[PDB]
Design a protein around this ligand. Structure first.
Ligand code: ANP
Ligand code: MG
Lengths: 299, 17, 568
């Protein structure tokens, strides 16, 4: 199994192109990165028009030779970490799936399955129905629902990538001394980041990019997104992490920080989430809260 | 061969960059 | 067999002919070794081996044709260039088999991507028209230029005589009209295009071709002429016909300056004096608006259509010629060829009927003998006309002066009338400008620079690049604050129109106002429409609407509309 985004569905080319690790290793947000991928497939001996075919229908010979082709070629691109072992399950004649693909389907169903207090209530109630839309997909009798989950997973990753490139190309990351700050004031559709899970996926994209872009300055990161209906920013506090191939674990400190500023502050804020690393605050109060936060020694 | 080194350098820059 | 020749040993052709010397095994092996040694070793002055950099990009695009410049091959190992010019059909076989070795040195197992690579020659240093070809040119490499008159469909062709195929297509090439001598008809030739070169060119393009000149027996020619006369053909080897950050920064620099709209209009049609409103309308049509659609019952075009009523000799045909050279794609008189471009009409029942359908739709549909098919128009129309005989009559409304149906005047965004008015000072200004331009054009670098900068306030190369950039990049939108005022002005104009008994203003005019405001925003690279854009659009449309009316109605309109046509 390969750390490639949904290999056995969509295509081999899409598997590399949307992989969260490959983007950090080859810088796919710009053309000098994309050309590296074209160059790789040309050297590997795979015709680029077949790499884009649906992986079920891709030719049998390439399918069985792929396991050796990677051993000869990933080293030249510094990309050897793609290779690993994992668990695969199959039932009758309906074809294989790995656990890594299964959890992405589940997560996708969680995210996208189908004055202020009432709207909050309605939103929170909608998110609970997706629990059962996920629950019922754990049954082998209901593979039909699992396929829908996979179709949603692909669109979610597409929309995430199309926001990440905008953040990096417009250089919206602000490099403060103690931590890195990023705030989304507008977007193609900013509603997708109103759910915690989706926000976390975007954060996970940016963290791999920041982890590989320079050897220096492993820093905490803060990410926020506005909502036009509440006029509140949804805020998340994110750790750094060490690269895949490299020894105590680090600890998320935002909890105490957020808690202390909340206990002190004039600001209109909310803390009710199980994960304390996630908070909400009104439009005008974001800047004084972040000012008091950066003035604090708790970071 | 030294004269053809520029060719192989252009090939090796794919490894480097 | 084992021993090889030196390059100096090839200086003497030892057999009775070139082809019978190239085809010998020791000579051929020597040529192969030398070509490979050139391709692995040639450099820029900066080192930076170009062919190692081209083979690299061959795989990056999954391509099939390697391109070699003839001047490089003539700059060292000159004898190989001479042999290539004399015997291309042999030399290129050897060169192709060397190019595959060089590409596999970068990309092993590239044979699984494509089985065979073709070398394309460029910059061959001598040129013929279709006059100078003679029998001595047979089987020699030649370089030729002309216009592509006719093109066949693409077909597969059997490669070997287990089976394999390749693509095939034939093109007819004709002498360009500027090259043909006076009082003579143009000549023709026919070109064969193979695997990688099919659909490289379109009918009516002006094209440049390198290839082998070749001949064969034909029974019908011999039968009709009564002499042993062979037929000839050209087998093509290669065929020939964006911006940087610096350009973007320069565009943004000039757009940040005040009055850029006025400067763009001033740069429009430099050779023609006066007629600023016509230049304004033409600029607006060339930039255009944004198309929109609402699947709930409505759609709005981005194109802007303009009609100009011209007195005899008031510069109409010259500005159409100017637009034809300025614009990116266009048709002059066929609407398929005008797709996403500008269409030009300089004079004027089935033609009008076609235009009726074209103005109502944005796409054309037709059926014939039970067949059904569709085509796209998607274009801006600029038209001009002569007002129902020798002279326009200002005492009458527009309909009396034209041969058009009423919906035509409804659906044109902008209407304007141009007249040869009498004024001694204007006549003197025109005459001085005309003789000055006449002297400045006389056949008898610094002179050109002075001439250019006196001609226009913007260099027109930058203006054409700017228009293309703005059209491809900029997509403006309205601001919701001032639209209440626009609705009030619309209602006021309608009330005033009814009050004087005028033909009423309509939703088409309001749509045109918004579209013209978008175009004005696009002209300065602004993604927002602004109040001054709406003001200018309102002035243009209101003045155009006023010009269509009878004289008494015109006076009442301008007396009331003063707070729109002049004030705001
Ligand atoms: N600034 C100018 N103003 C008016 N006429 C000009 C100007 N400069 C040149 N001309 C000449 O005047 C004519 C411009 O009008 P134009 O419409 O091109 O002529 P025309 O086509 O023969 N008249 P028409 O057949 O009714 O369109 C041409 O003969 C030009 O050479
Ligand atoms: Mg004319």
């Amino acid at each position: 199994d390969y750390y490639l985004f949904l290999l056995r569905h969509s295509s081999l080319y899409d598997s590399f192109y949307y992989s969260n690790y490959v983007n950090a290793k080859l810088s796919l947000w710009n053309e000098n990165g994309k050309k590296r991928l074209h160059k790789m497939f040309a050297r590997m001996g795979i015709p680029l028009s077949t790499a884009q075919e649906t992986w079920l229908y891709m030719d049998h010979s390439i399918k069985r030779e792929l396991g050796i082709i990677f051993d000869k070629n990933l080293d030249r691109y510094g990309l050897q970490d793609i290779i690993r072992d994992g668990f695969v399950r199959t039932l009758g004649y309906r074809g294989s799936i790995s656990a890594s693909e299964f959890v992405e389907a589940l997560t996708a169903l969680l995210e996208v399955g189908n004055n202020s207090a009432q709207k909050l209530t309605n939103l929170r109630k909608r998110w609970v129905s997706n629990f059962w839309l996920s629950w019922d997909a754990l049954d082998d009798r209901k593979v039909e629902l699992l396929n829908r989950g996979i179709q949603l997973a692909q669109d979610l990753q597409r929309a995430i990538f199309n926001t990440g490139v905008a953040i990096l190309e417009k250089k919206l990351i602000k490099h403060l001394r103690i931590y890195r700050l990023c705030v989304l004031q507008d977007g193609p559709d900013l509603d997708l980041y109103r759910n915690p899970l989706t926000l976390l996926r975007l954060g996970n994209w940016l963290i791999e990019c920041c982890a590989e872009s320079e050897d220096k300055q492993l820093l905490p990161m803060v990410l926020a997104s506005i909502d036009e209906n509440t006029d509140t920013y949804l805020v998340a506090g994110l750790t750094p992490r060490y690269p895949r191939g490299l020894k105590k674990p680090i600890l998320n400190n935002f909890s105490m920080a957020f808690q202390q500023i909340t206990a002190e502050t004039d600001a209109k804020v909310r803390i009710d989430n199980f994960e304390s690393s996630i908070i909400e605050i009104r439009r005008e109060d974001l800047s004084p809260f972040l000012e008091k936060l950066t003035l604090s020694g708790l970071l | 061969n030294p004269k053809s080194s520029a060719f192989f350098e252009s090939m090796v820059e794919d490894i480097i960059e | 067999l084992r021993e090889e020749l030196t390059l100096e040993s090839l200086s003497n052709v030892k057999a009775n002919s070139y082809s019978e010397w190239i085809t010998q095994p020791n000579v051929s092996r020597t040529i192969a070794r030398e070509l490979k040694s050139f391709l692995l070793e040639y450099t820029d002055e900066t080192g930076r081996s170009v062919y190692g950099a081209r083979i690299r990009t061959l795989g990056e695009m999954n391509s099939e044709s390697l391109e070699v410049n003839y001047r490089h091959l003539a700059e060292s190992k000159a004898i190989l260039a001479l042999f290539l010019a004399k015997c291309p059909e042999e030399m290129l076989k050897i060169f192709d088999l060397v190019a595959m070795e060089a590409t596999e040195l970068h990309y092993p197992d590239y044979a699984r991507i494509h089985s065979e690579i073709h070398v394309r020659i460029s910059d061959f240093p001598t040129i013929y028209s279709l006059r100078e070809l003679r029998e001595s040119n047979l089987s020699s490499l030649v370089r030729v230029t002309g216009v592509v008159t006719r093109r066949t469909g693409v077909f597969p062709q059997l490669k070997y005589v287990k089976t394999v195929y390749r693509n095939y297509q034939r093109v007819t090439l004709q002498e360009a009209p500027g090259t043909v001598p006076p009082g003579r008809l143009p000549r023709h030739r026919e070109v064969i295009l193979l695997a990688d070169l099919v659909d490289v060119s379109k009918p009516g393009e002006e094209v440049e071709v390198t290839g082998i000149y070749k001949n064969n027996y034909d029974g019908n020619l011999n039968a009709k002429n009564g002499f042993p006369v062979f037929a000839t053909i050209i087998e093509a080897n290669s065929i020939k016909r964006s911006w940087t950050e610096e350009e973007e920064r320069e565009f943004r620099k000039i757009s940040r300056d005040r009055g850029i709209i006025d400067k763009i209009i001033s740069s429009m049609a430099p050779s023609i004096y006066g007629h600023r409103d016509i230049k304004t309308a033409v600029a607006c049509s060339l930039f255009g608006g944004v198309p929109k659609n609402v699947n709930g019952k409505h759609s709005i075009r981005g194109d802007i259509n303009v009609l100009l009523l011209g007195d005899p000799g008031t510069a109409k045909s010259q500005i159409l010629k100017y637009v034809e050279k300025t614009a990116h794609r266009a048709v002059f008189a066929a609407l398929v060829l005008a797709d996403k471009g500008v269409c030009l009409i300089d004079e004027f029942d089935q033609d009008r009927t076609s235009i009726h359908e074209a103005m109502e739709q944005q796409s054309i549909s037709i059926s014939k003998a039970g067949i059904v098919t569709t085509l796209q128009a998607r274009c801006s129309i600029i038209a001009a006309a002569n007002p129902n005989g020798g002279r326009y009559n200002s005492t009458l409304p527009l309909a009396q002066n034209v041969s058009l149906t009423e919906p035509i005047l409804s659906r044109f965004d902008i209407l304007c009338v141009v007249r040869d008015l009498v004024d001694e000072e204007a006549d003197e200004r025109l005459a001085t400008f005309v003789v000055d331009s006449h002297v400045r054009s006389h056949p008898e670098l610094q002179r050109q620079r002075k001439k250019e900068e006196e001609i226009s306030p913007i260099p027109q190369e930058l203006l054409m690049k700017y228009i293309h950039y703005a059209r491809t990049k900029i997509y403006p939108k309205l601001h919701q604050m001032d639209m209440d005022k626009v609705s009030r002005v619309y209602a006021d104009l309608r009330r005033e129109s009814i009050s004087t008994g005028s033909f009423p203003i309509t939703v088409r005019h309001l749509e045109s106002i918004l579209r013209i405001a978008e175009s004005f925003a696009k002209m300065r690279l602004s993604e927002f429409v602004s109040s001054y854009d709406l003001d200018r659009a309102i002035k243009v449309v209101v003045d155009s609407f006023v010009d269509a009316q009878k004289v008494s109605v015109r006076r009442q309109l301008r007396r009331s509309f003063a707070i729109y046509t002049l004030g705001h």
